[PDB]
């Protein structure tokens, strides 16, 4: 499948999605720490071998892993700074995104 | 007096005499050792089984207490 | 001066219209600003301008608790008639040398 | 103006607000085991949203759940039904019945659907009072 | 559900060993199931969500 | 259409407002939100399966006995009995009852 | 005093005249003042307790219950009475036989 970009992201506190906009980018200027969300990638996720372990726990509590794999960009550990521009390039027929 | 502080409910007292003293609302075991025995027998049903557990528990009526009650 | 404020300014490796120098050079300009604050230890001040000229010190619109040391401490250049400039100045109180990343760590809040 | 359930029976609603004056430990040595088990199921989820008093506000709500189900028979679904409900009900309040178009875009569901959504929890809005 | 074996009995496999009956060993299944979610033995395991 | 709704979600919707309304008369922040989710660990504790929720009063009974006897005092007994409609017997239990259960709170 | 009161005996009276009037019966006063001495002669001196909490009224609020119990009607007949259906089960339970010897002797 197809992967797509957005802030829609599985298993993820909205504090780490505070700074992303509706389209999953972070904004100009905003001040950005090691290990954050710069832009939010998610990609189809394949078929997963369940152990009886993990099995159990899924019938315990009840959630469901839908197909969905997070692959978003993060800011490399130990990197401070602010986000000064961003560019967006998209493949022409494809539709973009109301942040491009 | 550390008993002067603690309230009636550590008498194990009979039904009756437990009920006959909570009809005049009362809560701290200086107040029944401030009262004398010549007016605690107006109250209907209890003459004959507070002077043994308050001898028992070093206690009798009739003595003086000021600063009461000293909240 | 600790924090600062600026309209239409989203970081401060942006440029405004108008303004002759860059707005790191406003706020190493600022970071230089003799400021007296007898009553409280926190204080926000107001900077507008508009016209060509220098701006100074004494352009801030002064407050009674606040006493400005040096009135012709130039802090930015205008060059557009119709360029205006509107600023946000936050003053603490404290002792030592206190580095933008402490301030940033100790408070928790967005 | 308290409007809502214990308006109508206040006597229920003053034993509500007479649980403080009791605290816990004995209190649910007389209660029944299950809704010991709802009690603390209630305050798990309770001290994940940093409320204060879990055990005061737990017993609150339980008592209230025994009040209404209390003589009633009562069937609990699971799954994505319950967001599924969940979305229901944040459709029919946001409906003000000129934003439909807005919740056309919000929920994103068939014109018949939100229909059977608004029909629905309007008799689940008229069953109360 | 397999823990411990080299495979997991579905409900009629474990049928034909201890009792056919379907909804008994269902409802005793269920039994276990909240038996687990009390948060008295979930503490742990609820830990284990966030994976 | 009775039994449409006998596997109907419909009880999960008519419990939110249960939650509700003790929450707005408690008066605490966002009834709506807190409810929901209040709701959801319930569906999880109790997904699918057989249980006996403590019907017909007999909570309630636990609440309007704990303030008879702090209105008990000695020889109204008459006068809560009216007002509960109860009667001598229950009202000798009760009072008995919760008697043992305050000297357990004075005596150590 | 109330315990040792002879005031019950006239509140027997009218509780029994509203009664009768609303049957219908003649001279409903009279008819339930020597019924007040019936009571008088019979319970004079006899501790005597009968049953509270409606303990007649739900044994009839029993029949009509099973009356209008069809072996479909389970939940309305739950909802008009606000009692739960264990306990309608168990009571329809027993109306069943006792309307079965009712039916069959």
């Given at each position: 499948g197809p992967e797509e970009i957005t802030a829609d992201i599985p298993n993820v506190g909205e504090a780490a999605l505070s700074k992303l906009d509706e389209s999953g980018?972070?904004?100009?200027?905003?001040?950005?720490?090691?290990?954050?969300?710069?832009?939010?990638?998610?990609?189809?996720?394949?078929?997963?071998?369940?152990?009886?372990?993990?099995?159990?726990?899924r019938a315990i509590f009840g959630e469901k892993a839908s197909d969905v794999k997070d692959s978003s960009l993060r800011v490399p550990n130990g990197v401070s700074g602010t986000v000064i521009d961003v560019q967006v390039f998209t493949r022409d027929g494809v539709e973009k995104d109301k942040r491009a | 007096?550390?008993?002067?502080?603690?309230?009636?409910?550590?008498?194990?007292?009979?039904?009756?005499?437990?009920?006959?003293?909570?009809?005049?609302?009362?809560?701290?075991?200086?107040?029944?050792?401030?009262?004398?025995?010549?007016?605690?027998?107006?109250?209907?049903?209890?003459?004959?089984?507070?002077?043994?557990?308050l001898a028992s528990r070093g206690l009798s009526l009739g003595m003086r207490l000021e600063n009461w009650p000293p909240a | 001066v600790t924090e600062v404020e600026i309209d239409g300014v989203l970081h401060e490796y942006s440029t405004k219209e108008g303004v002759q120098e860059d707005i790191l050079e406003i706020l190493l300009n600022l970071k230089g600003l003799?400021?007296?604050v007898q009553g409280k230890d926190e204080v926000i001040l107001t900077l507008n301008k508009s016209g060509i000229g220098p701006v100074t010190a004494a352009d801030i619109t002064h407050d009674g608790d606040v006493?400005?040391?040096?009135?012709?401490?130039?802090?930015?250049?205008?060059?557009?008639?119709?360029?205006?400039?509107?600023?946000?100045?936050?003053?603490?109180?404290?002792?030592?040398?206190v580095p933008a990343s402490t301030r940033i760590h100790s408070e928790e809040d967005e | 103006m308290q409007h809502d359930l214990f308006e109508h029976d206040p006597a229920i609603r003053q034993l509500i607000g007479?649980?403080?004056?009791?605290?816990?430990?004995?209190?649910?040595?007389?209660?029944?085991?299950?809704?010991v088990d709802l009690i603390d199921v209630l305050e798990n989820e309770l001290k994940r949203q940093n409320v204060s008093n879990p055990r005061e506000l737990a017993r609150k709500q339980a008592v209230a759940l025994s009040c209404f189900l209390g003589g009633r028979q009562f069937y609990i679904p699971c799954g994505d039904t319950?967001?599924?409900?969940?979305?229901?009900?944040?459709?029919?309040?946001?409906?003000?019945?000129?934003?439909?178009?807005?919740?056309?875009?919000?929920?994103?569901?068939?014109?018949?659907?939100?229909?059977?959504?608004?029909?629905?929890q309007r008799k689940l809005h008229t069953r109360r009072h | 559900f397999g823990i411990d074996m080299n495979?997991?009995?579905?409900?009629?496999?474990?049928?034909?060993?201890?009792?056919?009956?379907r909804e008994r060993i269902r409802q005793i299944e269920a039994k276990a199931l909240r038996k687990l979610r009390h948060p008295s033995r979930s503490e742990v395991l609820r830990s284990f969500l966030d994976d």
């Open positions: 980018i972070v904004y100009i200027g905003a001040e950005v720490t090691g290990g954050d969300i710069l832009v939010g990638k998610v990609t189809p996720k394949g078929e997963t071998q369940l152990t009886p372990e993990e099995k159990l726990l | 007096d550390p008993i002067l502080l603690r309230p009636v409910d550590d008498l194990e007292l009979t039904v009756r005499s437990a009920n006959c003293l909570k009809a005049e609302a009362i809560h701290y075991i200086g107040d029944l050792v401030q009262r004398t025995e010549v007016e605690l027998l107006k109250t209907p049903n209890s003459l004959t089984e507070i002077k043994d557990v | 003799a400021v007296r006493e400005i040391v040096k009135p012709q401490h130039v802090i930015c250049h205008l060059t557009d008639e119709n360029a205006s400039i509107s600023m946000r100045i936050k003053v603490q109180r404290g002792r030592g040398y | 007479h649980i403080d004056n009791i605290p816990a430990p004995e209190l649910e040595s007389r209660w029944p085991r299950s809704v319950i967001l599924t409900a969940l979305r229901d009900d944040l459709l029919y309040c946001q409906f003000n019945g000129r934003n439909m178009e807005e919740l056309r875009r919000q929920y994103r569901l068939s014109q018949p659907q939100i229909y059977q959504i608004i029909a629905r | 495979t997991d009995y579905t409900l009629e496999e474990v049928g034909k060993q201890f009792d056919v009956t």
